[PDB]
Design a protein around this ligand. Structure first.
Ligand code: NPO
Ligand code: NPO
Ligand code: NPO
Lengths: 565, 565, 565
C-alpha cells in the first residue's frame, strides 16, 4: 504493497496539516498511543515583530483529537512549532517545522479588489500585542440572490399571476472567516466549503453565516440558512442541525446557555395570519433548542411585541438593506417579504441579538427596528429600552425611565432627545448583551437617531454604550459611552458588536460597515479595544472588504488558552 | 401559482404521512398556527382483535414537530385515528382516516423466504395485550462483507505480499427495524435507508445498527459502524456524529447517562502494540462522548483487564463468535482481525453491553469472552463476576465470591461449576444491566458453559439471571433465574437481552438466535415476559428471520406514553 | 432587497472567476445575451519573460458556457486579459483585469518539503516558448492506504481467521494536477476536491487519478478508483460514471475511440478461478464502454495471454511497488492481491496503457510484466513484442521478429540481448501508442532489462523508442531511440510516457520517477521535447515532488487552440 501513513515527526506521531479538512492553518500531532499530560503548544512569531501564539491543551482535547492540536499557523510558511509535555514522569519537548499551504477565496469576479481582505494596523498599545480577533465577514457571490421561498397567492393578486415569494431565502452570501493578530497577519482560516456552497443549489449549504459565539467548552456555535452548527478551532464540525420543521431563515445570532440549550433567531414558516394568508415571518421568532435539535421553547414576537409600531421604521435610511440617504416611506401595500414594513410577514422587528439572563430565566433581545426588550419565560415583556413614541399600553408601561447617577429623572421627548444630559437611547442597535460587570452593553449604530434623519448624512455617528438597569425601580442609567466624537469615520450604519473585556478593562468593539456608502470603495471593519477608564485606544485595526460596498458582520476576541479544554 | 400545500384535514392543519421520510407508519397533524394543549392521540385497532395505541403528546413535541405526531399505524391500511386537544379553553376532537403505504425490504436474494420477517403469537396473558416491542434485527445483503480496513504489514509477512487487513469493517449488514404488537402486527417501521446503504460504498452508511437504547427524552441512541445517532419515533434523525478520529467500529451498545453524555463500545484505530505493530483493536474500548461528539473519557480495556486470559476463549463453539459444535482451538499465529484469540488486535474481550452506575460514577461491562466487570472512573477494576480460572492477580482478588440467601459461601470449582446450589456464573453473556430493583440482570447465553463444550451439541441452555452484589463484602448472590429447563429450544448462542419491568413485575427477554444452527431454517427471535413472582409466561412471541440462519440482535419494550414528551 | 449579481465588466457580462468551482486559474466572461462570433482570448505574460496564452473559442463552447472561457491565468495575480469578438458586423474588444486567488495543496504532513511542487527550467529552445504541459502527478495522504476489498477465505486458511483482502483498493492517493509553462509557472490547477476526498470514506471519491487523455472534443477523460470521468479545461465535469458492476480498480489509462466509446483498464471483481476461489483480478481486463457507461465489450487477458509466464516477473526490482535493488523472488503461496506473482488474482500482467487501432478494430496494450501485444476484436492475439523466453505456443508463434533497415533478421537470445545491433525490446514499459507517423512509440523504462538485474543499480537506463511493425511479414524494426546514453539521471523505473509531436517534429517525453530511490529526496519528473531529426533537446523542465520519494505518473502536451471547440 500500500502507501504507508506519514511517519512520526519526533517523539510522538506524525504531524498532520488540517486533519479535518476545514482549517488549513491548523495541524495535529498524532498521539501514536503515547500517554501524555501537561501539554503546551507554542507557534513562534514570523520575523522580527511576529506574534507568538501559546496555549495549554486539556485531556478532553487530546482524547478527542487523538493528538495535539496546533493552532495559529501562518499561510504558505515553514512554521516553527514547539510542543511540550510530560510522559512517564519525564519532561519532553519537540520542535517541528510545519509547512502550510495557501488561503483561497473561492468567490471572485470583476468586483474583486484582490483575493483576500486587506488588514491595516493603526494602534497596538503595549500589553495588547498578544490579542487575536476572529472576523466574521463575507464576500459577494457572482450570481447574487438566486432563490426565494414560495408564498401564498393573494386574493387581491391577479388571476393569471404566478404565486409570490415569502421569507428571506435571498439572505445568502459566501463566508470569509479568519483570525487576525496585531501585526495584521491571518492566523486562522475556516474554509468557505465547511458550511457553504454557492455554486450548487443545495439549500442545506446556503445562507449567511452568523452568530459565531463561544460555548462553555471553548468551541463555537453558528447559524447559516436553515441549519445551525457547532465547530472548534481545529475546524471540526461538532454539530450540524436542520432547523425544526416549523422554522426558517436563522440569522444574526446563536448562543449556548448554561443549561446546554442554544438560543436561535429564526422566522416561522407557514405562519397563518389573521386574514388567513400564510407567510414565512421575518426575523421575529426566538427558539430555544437542545443538542438533539428539538424545540425546548419558542417566543413568537408577533404576539409579544407590537408589529404595528412604526415610530422607528418610518425614520430609517432605505439604503440600509441605490436609494441611500432617503428616509423610508412605509407603504400599506408592501408585498410580504424581507422588506421594511409593519405586520407579520414583513421586516417589522429585525431581532439581531440575544442574551440569556440566568438570574430570572429570561431573554434580552435587540430589535433593530423597535429597540431593546427583556421577555420572560412566561412570554411577558419585562422591560423596554426605546424612545417612548409609538408604544401603546400595555407595552408603554414597560418602558425604562432614564435617570442620572444620583437617581433623578432625565427629561426626554418622545423621540429620545434628552435635555441637559449625555443620556441617549439606542437606534438600530446590535449586540445587547450582559457584561461581566453586571450591566447591559449595546452597539448603538445610530441610523434613525432621535427618530429622524439629519439634514446631512455625515452628521450620523455610532456609540459603544453601557447601561445600568434597575428592574425593581424601572430605571435605566447610561454609565459609559464612546464614539460619538469620532464622526463619520466611526459610523457603522449596520452590523457591528461590542463586548466588555474584564481581563484588561477594555471595551472591545467591531464596527462592521464604516464607509459602506462610499460607492466603489472597500468597506471598513474596525477592531477596537478602548480602555474603559481612560478611553484611550489600546488597539485599532482596520479590515477592508475584498469587494466594494460589502459589509462585515461581527468579530470576536478569541483566547487560545480556552480553545482546547 | 404552482401546487398548493395539502389543505387542512379537520380543525387543525393537514395530516402528513411520514413527514421526515424515515418512518412510513407515522403521520403528523400540522398545527397550522393553532395554539393547543392536553393533546392525546388514539390509533384504533384493525379488526376485532386489533390492538389500540394511545398516548399523550407534550408541548416540546408539539413545538418540535409543529404538529401532533401520529404513531402506531398499520401498513397499507385506512387507519382510524382520533386526536383530542384543548384550544381556547374548549374541548376539541377530530377523527382522521390516515391511509399508509407498504413496508419495503430493500435487501432480498435467493436466500429470502419472503420479504418481511414472520411473527407467531404464542402466548399473551390477560392484561398484557397493549405491549409493544421494538425489534432490532437485520437482513443479509446480496454481496456480503465487501470491505476491510488496511493494517500494517507484519515483519514475518512475505516480502512481495500486499498488506493485511485489520479491525472489523466486515461487521456490516442491512437493518430490519420494526415494532410488533401482541397480535403480531407491525405498528412501526424504520426505513432501511435512514442510516444504511448497502449498495453504495460510502462507509458513512455502512455497519451494523445496534445499541438502540432509550434516552431521558423518550428518543433513542444507536451505533452503526463509524457513526453514532439519535432518533425519535417520528423517524427524525436528531443526532449524527462521526466517531472521534482515534476510534472505529462502534457496535453492540450506546447508552445516554444522566450527565447528558453517551457511552459507546468501539475499537482503537492505529493502536500501537508493544511490538510496534499498529492494529485496529476489536471491541475493547469504551468511549464517553458528549453531544458535540467530543471524547469526555476513554477506557482502554487492553490496559485494564487481561487480554491474554484464554480460560473462556478456548472453550468456545467455533460456530458462533457450519463449524458448529466444534470447540475453538486457539493459535499463536491467528492474524490480527475480528478473530477469536488473545491480545490487542484480536477478539479477546468482545464487550457487548454497558451500564452506568451513577452511585460511584463507574461502568459495568459485559465481556463475552471474559465475564462481567465493573471499572471505575479511575480505570481500576472494582469487581469481576466470572469463573476463577485464568485470572492472575491483581485481578483474581477482584472476583466476587458466590454466597447463598444467608450469605454463606457456595463452593465452586475454577470452571464455575458450583456444588449443591442453583448458583451459576454467566458464560458468553449479554446485557449486564442495573435493574430498577438494584440488582444486576444478565442474559446468560451459555456457550462454553463451565469453560468447556458439552458432550453433545444440543446440551446447551440460556438463562435470564439476576444477582445481588455486595461490593463492600465482595460477594454475589443469584436471586432469580429462568430458562435452564427450556433446553436447546430456548438457547441463544449469541446476542439477546433481558430487562426487569417494574410496572407489571415481569422479566422481559429477547432470545435473538434460537435455532441459529438449524441449517436452512429461519432463526427465531423470541420475545418473552415472565412473571417475576410465579415464573408464568405472560407474553411469548416469535419472530422469524426472512432468510435462514440469520440472527436477530435485541428488542426493546417500548412505551408510547414516553415517546413524545 | 437581495444581492445583485456581479455587473458587466465591459461590453459583455460579468467576469466570473472559476465558474464551476474546480479550476481556480480560469474565469468566464458571461455572454449576458450578446450574440457574438469570431472570439479570441489572450492572457498576457506576467513580467518581462512571461508566456502569453492565446486561443480561439468556438460556438459550441460559447453556447455551453454561456460565455467566453478564460484559460491560462496566474495564481494570486492581477491577470491582464484581452477578449476580441465580432458583434453586429463590428469588431469588438475588451481588456479585463482578472484577479485570482491561491492554489491549495490539501494534503500535507511532516513529509512535506513545501505546499507545491517545484519546477526547474533547464532548456527552452527558440520556437518552443509557447508550450504548455499538463502534469498528472500526486501527493501522499497522511493516513496512507486505509481500505481493502474483502476477498474469499481460503480452504488452506486457518479456521478462526478473518477473511482475506483482494484486489487493489489501497491503490489510492491525492491528485496534484497542473499545467506548467516554459517559465516554470503554473498556468492551470484542477482542484483536488474535484474528484478526490481522502479525509472521508466514500470510496466514490477514492483512487488514483490517471489516464488523462484528450478527446475529439478537446476535453479529457480520466479514471479514478471505481469511476471514470470526462472534464474540460474550465474544470467542468462533463461525465461521471461508476464502473459497470462486474469490474473494479480502473487505473493507468482511459482513451476515447472514434466510435464514441472509451477504452478502460480494470480488474474483474468476483472472478471465479478454476479452483473455485473468487478474487478481484489485478490490472488484466480491458473494457470498451459507451457514454451511457454500458459495456460494449470486454477483453479478459487471463484467457487471452499467459498468466503463468514469469520470464520478466522473476527479473524485476521488488522495490518498484524498503526492499529496493533486490531482484524479486516469486513464491508459489503469495496471497492473492496487488502483489507480484503469476495467475488470476495477482499482479501478473499490469497493463498500463491502451491504444485503439481503427484500421483493424483492435487494441494494442502495454503489459508491464509481459510486454506489448495487439489483441483483435475477436479476442485473439495478433502480435507480441517481447523477449522470446517463457512464451509457449500458441503465443510464441505471435512474437514479432527483429529486422534491420534492409529487412534482414537480427539475432537475439531469449532474453532480448541482440548481437551487432542497436535493437532492443522494451522492459516494464509504458505508453505503447500509435504515432501520427504510423509507428509504435514506447517509453522503455528498463527495469529487468534483458530479463535480469545488473551488477550495479546505476547501470540501468530508460529509452524513448519507436518501432516500425509489419504485421503481414511479422517483423519489427527499431527506427529511433533516445536516452540510453543519459544514464541514471534519465532513468524512470516506473510510470512515464512518450508521444510523437508532428507539429514541430519532436518526441515529447515525461520521465516520472527519476531518482525515485534516493531516500529523502524529491522525485523528479522530467519534461522533454527532443528534436526527432537532430536529437537536440528543445525543451527540458524538471518537476520536483512535494514529498520525498513520491512518483509522478504522466504529462501531456496541451494545446489551447484545441481546448474550446
Ligand atoms: O445588506 N446587508 O448586507 C445587511 C443588511 C442588514 C443586516 O442586518 C445584515 C446585512
Ligand atoms: O454473527 N453475528 O451477527 C454476531 C456475532 C457476535 C455478536 O456479538 C453479534 C452478532
Ligand atoms: O508505487 N507507485 O506509486 C506506483 C507503482 C507502480 C505504478 O504503476 C504506479 C505507481
Amino acid at each position: 504493497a500500500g502507501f504507508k501513513p506519514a511517519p512520526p515527526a519526533g517523539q510522538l506521531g506524525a504531524v498532520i496539516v488540517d486533519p479535518y479538512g476545514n482549517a488549513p492553518l491548523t495541524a495535529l500531532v498524532d498521539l501514536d498511543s503515547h500517554v501524555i499530560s501537561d501539554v503546551k503548544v507554542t507557534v513562534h512569531g514570523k520575523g522580527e515583530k511576529g506574534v507568538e501564539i501559546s496555549y495549554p491543551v486539556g485531556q478532553e482535547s487530546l482524547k478527542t483529537y487523538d493528538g495535539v492540536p496546533i493552532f495559529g499557523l501562518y499561510q504558505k510558511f515553514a512554521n516553527k512549532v514547539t510542543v511540550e509535555w510530560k510522559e512517564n514522569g519525564k519532561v519532553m519537548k519537540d520542535d517541528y517545522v510545519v509547512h502550510t499551504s495557501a488561503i483561497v477565496n473561492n468567490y471572485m469576479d470583476n468586483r474583486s479588489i484582490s483575493d483576500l481582505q486587506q488588514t491595516k494596523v493603526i494602534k497596538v498599545a503595549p500589553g495588547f500585542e498578544d490579542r487575536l480577533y476572529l472576523v466574521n465577514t463575507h464576500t459577494f457571490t457572482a450570481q447574487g440572490s438566486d432563490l426565494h421561498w414560495h408564498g401564498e397567492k393573494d386574493k387581491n393578486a391577479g388571476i393569471l399571476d404566478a404565486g409570490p415569494a415569502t421569507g428571506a431565502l435571498p439572505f445568502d452570501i459566501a463566508p470569509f472567516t479568519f483570525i487576525v493578530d496585531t501585526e495584521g497577519e491571518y492566523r486562522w482560516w475556516l474554509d468557505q466549503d465547511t458550511f457553504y456552497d454557492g455554486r450548487d443549489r443545495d439549500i442545506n449549504k446556503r445562507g449567511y453565516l452568523m452568530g459565531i459565539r463561544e460555548t462553555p467548552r471553548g468551541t463555537f456555535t453558528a447559524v447559516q440558512g436553515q441549519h445551525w452548527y457547532e465547530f472548534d478551532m481545529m475546524g471540526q464540525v461538532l454539530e450540524d442541525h436542520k432547523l425544526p420543521r416549523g422554522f426558517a431563515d436563522a440569522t444574526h445570532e446563536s448562543i449556548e446557555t448554561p443549561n446546554g440549550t442554544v438560543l436561535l433567531r429564526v422566522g416561522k414558516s407557514n405562519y397563518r395570519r389573521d386574514d388567513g394568508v400564510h407567510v414565512t415571518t421575518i426575523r421575529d421568532h426566538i427558539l430555544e433548542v437542545d443538542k438533539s435539535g428539538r424545540v425546548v421553547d419558542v417566543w413568537d414576537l408577533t404576539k409579544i411585541l407590537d408589529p404595528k409600531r412604526d415610530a422607528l421604521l418610518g425614520a430609517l435610511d432605505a439604503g440600509a438593506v441605490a436609494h441611500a440617504g432617503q428616509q423610508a416611506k412605509l407603504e400599506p401595500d408592501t408585498p410580504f417579504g424581507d422588506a421594511l414594513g409593519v405586520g407579520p410577514g414583513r421586516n417589522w422587528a429585525h431581532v439581531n441579538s440575544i442574551a440569556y439572563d440566568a438570574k430570572d430565566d429570561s431573554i434580552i433581545l435587540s430589535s433593530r427596528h423597535q429597540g431593546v426588550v427583556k421577555i420572560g419565560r412566561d412570554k411577558q415583556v419585562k422591560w423596554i429600552l426605546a424612545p417612548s413614541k409609538g408604544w401603546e399600553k400595555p407595552l408603554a408601561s414597560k418602558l425604562l425611565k432614564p435617570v442620572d447617577a444620583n437617581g433623578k429623572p432625565i427629561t426626554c421627548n418622545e423621540n429620545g432627545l434628552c435635555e441637559n444630559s449625555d443620556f441617549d437611547f439606542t437606534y438600530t442597535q446590535h449586540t445587547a448583551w450582559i457584561s461581566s460587570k453586571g450591566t447591559l452593553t449595546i452597539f448603538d449604530n445610530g441610523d434613525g437617531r432621535h427618530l429622524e434623519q439629519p439634514a446631512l448624512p455625515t452628521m450620523k455617528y455610532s456609540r459603544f454604550v453601557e447601561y445600568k438597569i434597575d428592574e425593581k425601580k424601572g430605571t435605566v442609567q447610561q454609565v459609559w459611552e464612546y464614539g460619538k466624537e469620532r464622526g463619520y469615520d466611526f459610523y457603522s450604519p449596520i452590523t457591528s458588536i461590542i463586548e466588555y473585556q474584564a481581563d484588561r478593562n477594555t471595551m472591545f468593539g467591531f464596527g462592521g460597515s464604516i464607509h459602506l456608502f462610499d460607492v466603489g470603495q472597500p468597506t471598513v471593519g474596525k477592531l477596537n479595544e478602548i480602555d474603559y477608564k481612560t478611553k484611550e485606544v489600546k488597539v485599532e485595526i482596520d479590515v477592508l472588504s475584498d469587494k466594494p460596498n460589502q459589509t462585515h458582520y461581527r468579530a470576536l476576541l478569541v483566547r487560545p488558552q480556552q480553545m482546547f479544554k
